[PDB]
């Protein structure tokens, strides 16, 4: 029947028309939410970078102070900068006799005792 086919076609066409109007609000709010999550991620990553750098600097500054202080407690070879075991005169110590011999031409200029 002609009228019944026309009504069925018309019904389908109307359903397609309703399909067109769908999902506009979702996509248009999706871009704006993308901007906000992107900005929040950039800010959080920047704060985490600053926190990590500050922490690494604090820890290595403490490690440096510990190394310097440990170093002040010992005597160091004036020729090779390894730990020394005997001394010639003020602020001139050596780890073995060959370092003393090697360093003598320079140390001779300013030696005592």
């Amino acid at each position: 029947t002609t009228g019944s086919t026309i009504a069925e076609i018309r019904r389908l066409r109307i359903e397609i028309e309703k399909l067109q109007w769908l999902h506009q609000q979702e996509l248009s709010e999706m871009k704006h939410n993308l901007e906000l999550t992107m900005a929040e991620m950039r800010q959080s990553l920047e704060q985490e970078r600053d926190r990590l750098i500050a922490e690494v600097k604090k820890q290595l500054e403490l490690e440096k102070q510990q190394a310097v202080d440990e170093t002040k407690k010992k005597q160091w070879c004036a020729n090779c900068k390894k730990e020394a075991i005997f001394y010639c005169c003020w602020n001139t110590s050596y780890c073995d006799y060959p370092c003393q011999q090697a360093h003598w031409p320079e140390h001779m200029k300013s030696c005592t005792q």
Copy 2:
């Protein structure tokens, strides 16, 4: 054949195309999320690289500090720079430090 059946077939195919389109929109939404996760991971890796450079430079400052310290004598009492010495590895910045330190240093001394 049946016209209404043929239309109903058409509806099924259109609804299927519509569901597919929906799958495309949500797979692109997912891909956008993966791209964001990839951006976070790549930025984190670059931060780790920067941190490694900062550690490399701070470790050099540590070594220079150590090497500088090896060049001087340090007060056995207060750890400031020393100007005279009592015996091996025992120097002082001033006489008041030497005096203050004598009760502990006496057990180990030369002169």
